[PDB]
Amino acid sequence: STAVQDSNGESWNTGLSINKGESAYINANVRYYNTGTAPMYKVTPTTNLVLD
Q: Whose Cβ is closer to other proteins: residue 20's or residue 42's?
A: 20
Let me know if 2 is exposed, middle or buried by CB neighbors in 10 A (0-12, 13-18, 19+). exposed
Would you tell me which residues interact with other proteins (CB under 8 A)? 19-22
Q: Whose Cβ is closer to other proteins: residue 19's or residue 29's?
A: 19
Name the phi and psi angles at 10, rounded to 5: -140, 130
Supply the minimum distance, in Å, between the C-beta of residue 8 and other proteins.
Answer: 43
Q: Whose Cβ is closer to other proteins: residue 43's or residue 49's?
A: 49
